């Protein structure tokens, strides 16, 4: 709510993800989205910025082999 | 720690340490090189004499697994001879079944798989020898493969196995092997073997030379004594 | 065949809704052979889309006659698809706030169909909707009776989510009867059952 987002960004895309992340992780995701927006000389955060920020912040190694289930 | 006592046990980093120890056994032996030139393959072995009592020809590290294939070994000589017999029987079976000389690619892929069969179970240990199979034919051409204790067979232009493998490879890289013939490659192999030899360390080596090429009609034979002595003289002169 | 008419109706969606209504109604009124695996999915999709459009055009006659007319058709498609179609059509009629006067009638018809098909969960949902309809149609006594039956049935199966809604409906019905003690008791039961579980924001807002 404090960031100048674009209407093309749907937060439910990243909310529905099964990653077990904390509130600081969410704040870091939004912060890196703003960071990527700033890098390209933009004052509005697009959906690609949020996708890249989520991938960067989560950076979760799989750590679980599929044969176990 | 218990992670290296068997070949059927993986290390927490995903490495079979028994195979690596078998590789170190190869790295503890004298250097044997092999160069695939334009019209054949030449094998050279720095066969040290541990005592003057052994006759000239004992512990032959150059084998004949077939009439057109030669084998240069490095590491445990007992395992080397066992693998030489395995390759001999593989070539014999190929000839008795399909009716023609076994291609070097197929012989390498078969003996390498026999070697790999010893790197999976705790009932056996990996072979402690690495060997190069070299051959020549008018159709296939000059071929040179190296197989390590793990069972990885790779084709080569110039290869070396032993404790001076890196220095031998550095000396080999200087050669323009893809253009010169066997008659020059024998001299250069002698030069490389003499260069990588350490006289202050284990000394009194013998140069074991063999080749297989069009000048031998695709037959692996020991290099004739006159040519071997000429190559030895050239190698000694190259050391100044 | 009918897929071309479905695409034509989809194109007519940009045009007048009633214009596409002709295509969808012609597809629905179309008779079908034994199986017609392609035609049955197209017919079901046409029924669903025509109901969706009538949910905006607000044609009580067409939407109401759809449910009473496709009843033979429900015996051809699979039970899951039939139940989904019944739920969608009845929900679209009930969300349309126009009190045409036959909401209770066709809700009871769907309840009878669910009883015939032995679909207990569907029947319970339809009975809760019927209690809501009874409250919205000033039929407080029938609402209380059906709410008591549904309350016992949902208590047996530990369906707290629907139990809270039925208890709230009973509390509203008793408040409409100016029976404050019974309405307070029903509200207390609803609040305790809601406390026993997680309430979605809609249910929590209704309870509050």
């Amino acid at each position: 709510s404090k960031m100048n987002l674009s209407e093309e960004v749907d937060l439910e895309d990243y909310v529905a993800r099964p990653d077990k992340i904390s509130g600081a992780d969410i704040n870091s995701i939004c912060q890196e989205s703003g960071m990527l927006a700033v890098r390209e000389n933009r004052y509005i955060v697009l959906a690609k910025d949020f996708e890249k920020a989520y991938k960067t912040v989560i950076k979760k190694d799989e750590q679980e082999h599929e044969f176990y289930k | 720690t218990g992670y290296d006592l068997s070949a059927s046990t993986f290390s927490p980093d995903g490495r079979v340490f028994q195979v690596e120890y078998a590789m170190k056994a190869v790295e503890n032996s004298s250097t044997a090189i092999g160069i695939r030139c334009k019209d054949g393959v030449v094998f050279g072995v720095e066969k040290l004499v541990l005592s003057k009592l052994y006759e000239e020809g004992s512990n032959k590290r150059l084998f004949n697994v077939d009439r057109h294939v030669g084998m240069a070994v490095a590491g445990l000589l007992a395992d080397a001879r066992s693998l030489a017999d395995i390759a001999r029987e593989e070539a014999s079976n190929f000839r008795s079944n399909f009716g023609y000389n076994i291609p070097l690619k197929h012989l390498a892929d078969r003996v390498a798989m026999y070697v790999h069969a010893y790197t999976l179970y705790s009932a056996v240990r990996p072979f402690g020898c690495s060997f190069m199979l070299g051959s020549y034919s008018v159709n296939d051409g000059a071929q040179l493969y190296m197989i390590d204790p793990s069972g990885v067979s790779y084709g080569y232009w110039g290869c070396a196995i032993g404790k001076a493998r890196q220095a031998a490879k550095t000396e080999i890289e200087k050669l323009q092997m893809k253009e010169m013939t066997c008659r020059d490659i024998v001299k250069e192999v002698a030069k490389i073997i003499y260069i990588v030899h350490d006289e202050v360390k284990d000394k009194a080596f013998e140069l074991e030379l063999s080749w297989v090429g069009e000048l031998t009609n695709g037959r692996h034979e020991i290099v004739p004594k006159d040519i071997r002595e000429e190559a030895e003289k050239y190698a000694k002169e190259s050391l100044k | 065949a009918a897929v071309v008419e479905f695409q034509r109706a989809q194109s007519l969606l940009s045009t007048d809704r009633e214009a596409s209504i002709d295509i969808l109604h012609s597809i629905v009124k179309r008779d079908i052979q034994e199986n017609d695996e392609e035609a049955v999915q197209v017919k079901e999709q046409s029924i669903l889309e025509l109901g969706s459009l009538l949910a905006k055009t607000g044609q009580a006659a067409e939407l109401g006659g759809l449910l009473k007319y496709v009843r033979p058709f429900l015996n051809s498609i699979s039970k899951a698809k039939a139940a989904r179609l019944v739920r969608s059509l009845l929900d679209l009629f009930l969300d349309m706030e126009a009190a045409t006067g036959q909401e209770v009638e066709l809700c009871l018809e769907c309840i009878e169909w669910a009883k015939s098909e032995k679909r207990t969960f569907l029947r319970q949902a339809l009975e809760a909707r019927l209690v809501s309809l009874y409250f919205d149609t000033k039929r407080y006594q029938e609402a209380l009776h059906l709410g008591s039956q549904l309350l016992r049935e949902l208590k047996k199966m530990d369906d707290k989510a629907l139990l809270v809604e039925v208890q709230l409906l009973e509390s509203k019905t008793y408040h409409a009867l100016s029976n404050l003690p019974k309405a307070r008791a029903a509200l207390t039961s609803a609040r305790t059952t809601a406390n026993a579980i997680y309430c979605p924001p809609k249910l929590q807002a209704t309870l509050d």
């Binding site: 044969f67 176990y68 | 892929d109 790779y154 | -």
Partner: protein, 242 residues
Amino acid sequence: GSSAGFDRHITIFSPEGRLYQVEYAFKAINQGGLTSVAVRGKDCAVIVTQKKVPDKLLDSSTVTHLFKITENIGCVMTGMTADSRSQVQRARYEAANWKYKYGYEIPVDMLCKRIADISQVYTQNAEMRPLGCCMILIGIDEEQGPQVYKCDPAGYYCGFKATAAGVKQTESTSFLEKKVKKKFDWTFEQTVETAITCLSTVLSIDFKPSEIEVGVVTVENPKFRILTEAEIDAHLVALAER
């Protein structure tokens, strides 16, 4: 990560129900330092893998992780080279046995199903270790079309629209997932370019037509062919010019 007895030395269950030997076999795949990427298109399947030739002495014609299991089925191996050759030989034998016993070419799904059944025994019997290799088979099916199947040391197996194995398996998987989300049935050239772009972007190499091997299968010719350096160079130039 609890342990009790020899649960880290043989394929027996740990206190929490884990086979540590199988996981170590999985870690053995990255020992080779190579990454393979397979991408499935609307009418083709492509396997690409980096080929590393440290010195000119090595015969680059023999360093090939692309193996022709059958005429219509190809594979790319990631992990221990000797175990890779073992799995390739076993797959070739199983394909030939299927052709002999049943009279028709073995389906790609069933080939890796049999291979994974073979490798599952290694994870149940304690006298052998699992093969530290991963097979990715690609082939054109009669009806299902292109098929890509990864085939891991644990005996797990699944079909894939686009998969990857090796050191950079996860980054390549993320890249291919992002590409697939766009939902484009890529043509042959598009699939080859997508695989090459995945490998290049993940590795940041800007490939030359001597550092990667590409093997393709297409519906028009349902045979596995390894692209020559000129054919790979054509795709590399096409990627560079855009």
